[PDB]
Amino acid sequence: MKEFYISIETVGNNIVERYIDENGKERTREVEYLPTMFRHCKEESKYKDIYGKNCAPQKFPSMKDARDWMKRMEDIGLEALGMNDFKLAYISDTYGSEIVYDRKFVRVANCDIEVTGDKFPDPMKAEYEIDAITHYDSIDDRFYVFDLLNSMYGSVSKWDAKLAAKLDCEGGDEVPQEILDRVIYMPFDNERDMLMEYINLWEQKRPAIFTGWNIEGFAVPYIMNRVKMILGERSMKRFSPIGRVKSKLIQNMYGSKEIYSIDGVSILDYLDLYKKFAFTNLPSFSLESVAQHETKKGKLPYDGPINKLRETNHQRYISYNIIDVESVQAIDKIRGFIDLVLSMSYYAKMPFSGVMSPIKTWDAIIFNSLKGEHKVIPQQGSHVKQSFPGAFVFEPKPIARRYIMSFDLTSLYPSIIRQVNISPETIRGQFKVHPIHEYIAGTAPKPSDEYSCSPNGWMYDKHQEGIIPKEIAKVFFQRKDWKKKMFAEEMNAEAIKKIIMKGAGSCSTKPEVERYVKFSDDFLNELSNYTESVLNSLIEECEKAATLANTNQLNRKILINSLYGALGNIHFRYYDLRNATAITIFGQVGIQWIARKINEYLNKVCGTNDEDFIAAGDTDSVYVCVDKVIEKVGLDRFKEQNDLVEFMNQFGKKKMEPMIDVAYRELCDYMNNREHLMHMDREAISCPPLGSKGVGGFWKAKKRYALNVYDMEDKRFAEPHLKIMGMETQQSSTPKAVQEALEESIRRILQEGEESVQEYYKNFEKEYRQLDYKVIAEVKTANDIAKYDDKGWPGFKCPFHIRGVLTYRRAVSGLGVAPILDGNKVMVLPLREGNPFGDKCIAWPSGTELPKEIRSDVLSWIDHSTLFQKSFVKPLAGMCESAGMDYEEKASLDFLFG
Amino acid sequence: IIRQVNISPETIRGQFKVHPIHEYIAGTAPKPSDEYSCSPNGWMYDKHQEGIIPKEIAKVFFQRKDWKK
Amino acid sequence: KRMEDIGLEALGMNDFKLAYISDTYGSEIVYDRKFVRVANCDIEVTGDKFPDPMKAEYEIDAITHYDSI
DNA sequence: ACGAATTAAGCAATTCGTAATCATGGTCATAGCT
C-alpha cells in the first residue's frame, strides 16, 4: 500500500503533514514546498490555459514571495496564471498517481459530551461543568467513557457495567453486552484531572477525523471554551497537533455558531454530513428521530427533565450518553459515510475538511485533470452577486385530477453543460437575443449552424469541445461503470446465495476472484463445490466490494449534483452570469417546451382540440396524464387495480419514448448543439384505487400536493403509498396525534372517498374530548409577566395566553404555588364562556399541571372545539375544498326526491 | 463595582454554584464563598489582591476627586 | 507571524508607535498649547449644482485658513 | 457556507411609522310592507 496522507497543514513558509507510511505507521513530515506559477506570454509555450494561449512558467523559492508576486501582478492589472492554493499543488506533485488507501489505518474518533445545568447550557460561554464524556476510537475500537462524580451539583455513585447490562425491569439500563465489553470506564473525583486526562488521551491517540452528532454545534465549542476558561489558552491548543486552533463567528440561521477550526485534525460534523449526503427529509433531525427512522432502535424512555436526571439516576445518565454514541456509530456503520468522505478526499486529492465545500473539491479534480493534460488553470475574478431567474414553477391548478403520472430528467444541469458546451473558453461572441416567447414557441428563426446558442444569447462553440463538459463526461462514465459493477456484484451475490440454498460443497480453499465483474455460469458451478464457511466468506468479500461500489457510485452522484452549485458561486474559478443564466433558461425552455408539446400530442391523440392536460409541473418535474387517456379507453377493461396499473405501464411505454425523443430532438436541432443528452423516465404513478370513490391525488398550492403513488421508479408496491409534500402531516407544528389524524384523513380522501371521511370526522370529534389535554391544548412562550397587570387588567393586549396566565395567577391565589416568571413556556387552555375564572382562556407553565383543585374546574370548562377549529378543521376544510370535497355532512332531502 | 468586587483578567479564581437572581436580591441564598470575592453571576475572584484594572481605576478616581474638591 | 504559525503567544505591544513613545520619554510630559500648531480651514465653491468632493469638477472660489501659532 | 483577510465605547427603553390582517360603522342598495 502506497504512502497515503492523513492530514495536511501549512506552518509559515513550510507545509507539514501527517501520513501513513508504507510500513503502516503514522509519521509527520515538514517540507519546504516550492510552487511554480505561470503567466501570459507572447512567445510560444507548450503550457496552454483553457483559452489556448501560451503560458510561460516561473518557479518560485518560497510561498510568501510567490504571494508577493501575485500581489504585484494584481496591482498592475496583469493576469497571473497557475493555481493560487498550494496544499492542493503539494498533494498533486507529492502523489500524481491515484492513491490506494485502507480505511482501517485512518483513526476516526466519535465523541459526545453531556452537561447538566438549570438554564439551557450555552455553547459559547459554557458556564456549567463537564461530567460525562464519551470518546469512541476505531483504531482501538474502544469507548473511553470519562465520568465525573463530585460536581458542584452533588456527588453521585459510580457506574456499574453489569447493572447497566440488566433489563429495565431489574432496574438496569439494557445496554447490549457487546458494547460494555468494548467500554473503558474512567471515574474522576474533581473536574480538572478529567480534562487533563482527556487532553492526554487526545495526545496519545490523535484522531484523523473527529466526528459526532451535532459536534460542531455543541461538543467542540463547549470543550474548547471550558478548557480555555478553566485550564488556559495553552492547554486548549494542546488538542491541535501543531498547536493552532481558531474560532470564527458565523451569523447564519440566528448565528451563535462559533465554528471551531483545529489545524491538523478534520472536523466533519455528522449532522450536516447526513443532511447533505442522504437526500432524506425527516420531520426532525434529532439523533433519536433519525436513529429510530433508520436503525429502528428505540431510545429507552426517561422521566423528568435532563438537568435533574444526573442526580436522580446517574447510572441511567451515563448509559444514555453511551447509547447516544453507539447510535451515532450505528448510523455511520449502516450508511457508510466515513468511507465516503475518505473516497472523496483521496479521489480529488484534497484535505478532508474541504469535502464540505463542493467548489473546493471541483477545483481540485479540475486542476488535477488539467495538469494531466499539461494545462494551467486561470485565476478567479472577484465579482458581486447578481440574482438571476430561477426555476419557472408551473402554476398549480388547485383542482383534484385523480390519476397522475410524474416524471423528470435525471441530472438536468450536467446534461445542459455536456450537450451544449458552457465551458468558459468556448464563448465565440454575442448572439441576437429574441423575447422568450419567440424561443419557446419556435417562432424565432434558427439561431446558427456554425455555433450552438442558448436563450441567454451567447454564442457557444459546437466544433470545439470545452473542458468542463469533458470533466462531466469523465465523471459520468466513471459513475456508469461503477453502477454496472454494482449490478454485476449484486447478481453475483444473489447467485452465490442461491447456490448456498441449493447446498454448499466441501472445499475450504479460497481461490482468486476477479473483482467488479460478472461471474460466469461455469464459475458458479465451480463455486458450488466450496464449503459454506468459504462461500460465506466469499459473499462477505463481495459485500465489501459492493460497499466500495456504493461509496464510488454515490460519490460520483453527489459530485455531479454539486457541479451546478459550484458554477453558480462567484468564488468558483469559472463564474459567469452568462453561463449560469444560459443553463437556467435552457432548463426553463426545455420544460415549458415539453409541457406544450405533451399538450398538443394528447390533443392530437385523443382527438381533443385546444384542450389543456399538463398538470402542476413544479420546477423541472412535470406531471401529466390528468383525466383523459384512462377514460378514453374505459375502466371496464380492469378487473383489478393492478391490471389498470399494467395498462398504465403499457401505454406509457407506447407513448413515452418516441414523443419525448422527437420533442427534445426538435429542441436540440433548433439550438443546433453537438449532441442531445436528455431522457425522460416515468418516476411516480398515482391513481385512485379501482372501484372506490377516493380521489387519489389533489393539489393545494405551490409545492403543496399529495399523490396516491403505486409504482415509484419501477418499484411495484403491494399497498398504496401516500407521497405527501407541503401539508401539516410532515410539519411538526401540530401535535403528533393531530399529525396522525391528518395523515389518516388524507389517506381517506385519496383512497375511498366522502362518506368514510365524514364518518371518521364524526368519530374523531366524538373521541377528541377524552384525549389528554397535554396533547390537545396550546403551548406558547410567556414574557413580560407584569404587562401592566393592574390587578388582572390586560394592559398591553394579552395575546390570549398572557390573559390565561393572569387567570391562572388569580385562580391559584392563596395556594402558594410558584408564580409564573418571564420567558417561561406556558401551556394555555381556553375556558368555556361564562366561566367563574372570568376569562375564556387559562395558561399554566408548560410541563406543569393546573392545581387539581382548580384543574378539575378548568377541565369542566374547555372549548375542545375552538382548538379543533383552529388546528384541525381549517386544514381539512382547505384540503377538501381544494379537491371538490366537503368534510361536513349536508344531509339533504334528495333521498326522498327520487 | 470593579474596585469593590476586585475584578480583572488576572484575578479570576474559579466558579461557584449560581443561584437565580430572585433569591439573591432577597438575601435568602447562602453566602457563595468565605475566602473569595464573589460576583452574582456565579464567579469568584482573588481576595486581598489588586488587579491592573482596579488599580488604574483607583488612580483615575483619585485624580478626578482631587479636581472635584 | 512565525510565532503565530507555531502557536505560542507573543507578548508585548504589537504597535510600535507608542512603544517608542514610552521608550523615548518614560517620565511625564510637560506640554504647551502655544507651541502646537493648530489650523482651521474653510472652503467655498461656486457651481450650478452641489459640488462633489469625489469629483471636484468645479473651481475653488473662496479659501480661508486660520493658524494658531 | 467558506469567501479567508481582515479594524476600534456598551445596553435598555420609548415612540412612531409602515405593512399585514381581522372586526366593523356609515352609508348605499335591495327590497318588503304599508
Q: Which long-range contacts (CB under 8 A, 24 or more apart) does A3-9 make?
A: A4/A99, A4/A100, A4/A101, A4/A346, A5/A91, A5/A94, A6/A106, A6/A208, A7/A208, A7/A241, A7/A264, A7/A265, A7/A266, A7/A351, A7/A352, A8/A87, A8/A90, A8/A91, A8/A351, A9/A242, A9/A244, A9/A263, A9/A264
On whether C44 is known to bind a ligand per the annotation, the reply is yes
CB A486 within 8 A of CB A546: yes
Count Cβ–Cβ pairs < 8 Å, chain A vs chain B: 10
Q: Which of A273, A275, A552, A619 is nearest to A413 (CA)?
A: A619
The length of chain B is 69
Spacing of C-alpha A826 from chain mean position: 33
CA dihedral over A570, A576, A579, A582, signed as positive or negative: positive
Q: Which nucleotide's C1' is closest to A67 (Cα)? A: D5
* Cβ of residue B16 closer than 8 Å to a chain A Cβ: yes
Phi, then psi, of A829 in degrees rounded to 5:
-125, 110
Say how far apart CA A492 and CA A520 lie, in whole Å: 9
- With a CB cutoff of 8 Å and minimum separation 6, the contacts of B19 are B29, B42
Q: Which of A116, A134, A112 is nearest to A126 (CA)?
A: A116
Say how far apart CA A259 and CA A486 lie, in whole Å: 38
Between chains, do A127 and B42 touch, taking CB under 8 Å as contact? yes
* Cβ of residue C11 closer than 8 Å to a chain A Cβ: no
Q: Which residues of chain A are within 8 Å of residue B17 when distances are taken between CB atoms? A: 152-153
Q: Which residues of chain C are within 8 Å of residue A242 when distances are taken between CB atoms? A: 6-7
Residue of A115, A116, A118, A307 to mutate when probing chain B, most B C-beta within 10 A: A118
Say how far apart CA A401 and CA A698 lie, in whole Å: 6
State the structure-solving technique.
cryo-EM
Helices (H) and strands (E) in chain C, counts: 2, 2
Say how far apart CA A721 and CA A276 lie, in whole Å: 25
Q: What is the DSSP letter of B9?
A: S
Shortest distance between the Cα of C10 and any Cα of chain A, in A, equals 12
CB A448 within 8 A of CB A672: yes
CB A183 within 8 A of CB A240: no
* Cβ of residue A67 closer than 8 Å to a chain C Cβ: no
**Which triple of cell numbers denotes residue B36?**
473569595
Q: How many CA atoms lie within 13 A of A165 on its CB side?
A: 10
The length of chain A is 898
Say how far apart CA A236 and CA A234 lie, in whole Å: 5
* Cβ of residue A152 closer than 8 Å to a chain B Cβ: yes
Nearest C-alpha in A relative to B22: A821
Say how far apart CA A156 and CA A320 lie, in whole Å: 16
Q: Which residues of chain B are within 8 Å of residue A127 when distances are taken between CB atoms? A: 15, 18, 42
SS3 A375: strand
* Cβ of residue B15 closer than 8 Å to a chain A Cβ: yes
Q: What are the CA-CA distances from residue A539 to residues A521, A676, A864 (Å)? A: 17, 41, 59
* Cβ of residue B18 closer than 8 Å to a chain A Cβ: yes
A400-410: string of b/e by CB count within 10 Å (b at 16+)? Answer: bbbbbbbbbbe
Nearest C-alpha in A relative to B19: A118
Distance from residue A398 (CA) to nucleotide D18 (C1'), in Å? 33
Say how far apart CA A111 and CA A100 lie, in whole Å: 28
Distance from residue A847 (CA) to nucleotide D1 (C1'), in Å? 37
Say how far apart CA A433 and CA A457 lie, in whole Å: 5
**DSSP letters of A249-283?**
-B-SSSS-B--EEETTSEE--HHHHHHHSS----S
Could you tell me whether strands A55-59 and A36-40 are parallel, antiparallel, or unpaired per DSSP bridges? antiparallel
CA dihedral over A873, A876, A878, A883, signed as positive or negative: negative
- With a CB cutoff of 8 Å and minimum separation 6, the contacts of A192 are A230, A231
Q: Which residues of chain A are within 8 Å of residue C1 when distances are taken between CB atoms? A: 12
Q: Which helix (H) or strand (E) holds A686?
A: strand A682-686
Between chains, do A240 and C8 touch, taking CB under 8 Å as contact? no
CA dihedral over A519, A520, A526, A529, signed as positive or negative: positive
- With a CB cutoff of 8 Å and minimum separation 6, the contacts of A212 are A110, A111, A112, A219, A269, A270, A325, A328
Between chains, do A127 and B17 touch, taking CB under 8 Å as contact? no
CB A380 within 8 A of CB A575: yes
Q: Which of A478, A444, A450 is nearest to A464 (CA)?
A: A450
CB A428 within 8 A of CB A453: no
Between chains, do B15 and A153 touch, taking CB under 8 Å as contact? no
Q: Which helix (H) or strand (E) holds A712?
A: none
Name the burial class of residue C55, with classes exposed (0-12), middle (13-18) and buried (19+) by CB atoms within 10 angstroms of its CB: exposed
Q: Which residues of chain A are within 8 Å of residue C9 when distances are taken between CB atoms? A: 233
Distance from residue A897 (CA) to nucleotide D33 (C1'), in Å? 35
Say how far apart CA A504 and CA A499 lie, in whole Å: 7
Between chains, do A244 and C7 touch, taking CB under 8 Å as contact? yes
* Cβ of residue A153 closer than 8 Å to a chain B Cβ: yes
* Cβ of residue C9 closer than 8 Å to a chain A Cβ: yes
Nearest C-alpha in A relative to B13: A230
* Cβ of residue A243 closer than 8 Å to a chain C Cβ: yes
Distance from residue A238 (CA) to nucleotide D33 (C1'), in Å? 97
SS3 A506: coil
How many CB atoms lie under 10 A from the CB of residue B15? 18
Q: What are the CA-CA distances from residue C13 to residues A618, B51, C21, C23 (Å)? A: 61, 20, 12, 12
Nucleotides, chain D, CB distance < 7 Å:
1-4
State which amino acid sits at residue A825.
K
Q: What is the DSSP letter of A514?
A: -
Say how far apart CA A375 and CA A370 lie, in whole Å: 5
Shortest distance between the Cα of B3 and any Cα of chain A, in A, equals 23
Identify the bridge partners of residue A31 per DSSP, sorted by sequence position: A15
- With a CB cutoff of 8 Å and minimum separation 6, the contacts of A826 are A779, A780, A781, A782, A801, A804, A805, A820, A843, A844, A845, A846
Say how far apart CA A501 and CA A510 lie, in whole Å: 19
Q: SS3 breakdown of chain C: % helix, strand, coil, rounded to 5?
A: 25, 15, 60
State which amino acid sits at residue A823.
G
- With a CB cutoff of 8 Å and minimum separation 6, the contacts of A738 are A728, A871, A872
Q: Which of A136, A112, A110, A108 is nearest to A206 (CA)?
A: A108
**Which triple of cell numbers denotes residue A814?**
392563596
Distance from residue A294 (CA) to nucleotide D28 (C1'), in Å? 65
Q: Which of A596, A568, A592, A586 is nearest to A393 (CA)?
A: A592
Chains that touch B (3 or more CB pairs under 8 A): A
Q: What are the CA-CA distances from residue A847 to residues A804, A827, A828, A850, A868 (Å)? A: 16, 8, 11, 10, 22
Could you say which residues from 263 to 282 on chain A have a Cβ atom under 8 Å away from some Cβ of chain B? none
Q: Which nucleotide's C1' is closest to A562 (Cα)? A: D1
Q: Which residues of chain A are within 8 Å of residue B20 when distances are taken between CB atoms? A: 118
Nearest C-alpha in B relative to A231: B14
Chains that touch C (3 or more CB pairs under 8 A): A
Could you tell me whether strands A183-188 and A142-148 are parallel, antiparallel, or unpaired per DSSP bridges? parallel
Nearest C-alpha in B relative to A153: B17
Q: What is the DSSP letter of A873?
A: I
Minimum-distance residue to D1 (CA–C1'): A357
On whether B64 is known to bind a ligand per the annotation, the reply is yes
* Termini Cα distance of chain A: 87
Q: How many CA atoms lie within 13 A of A633 on its CB side?
A: 11
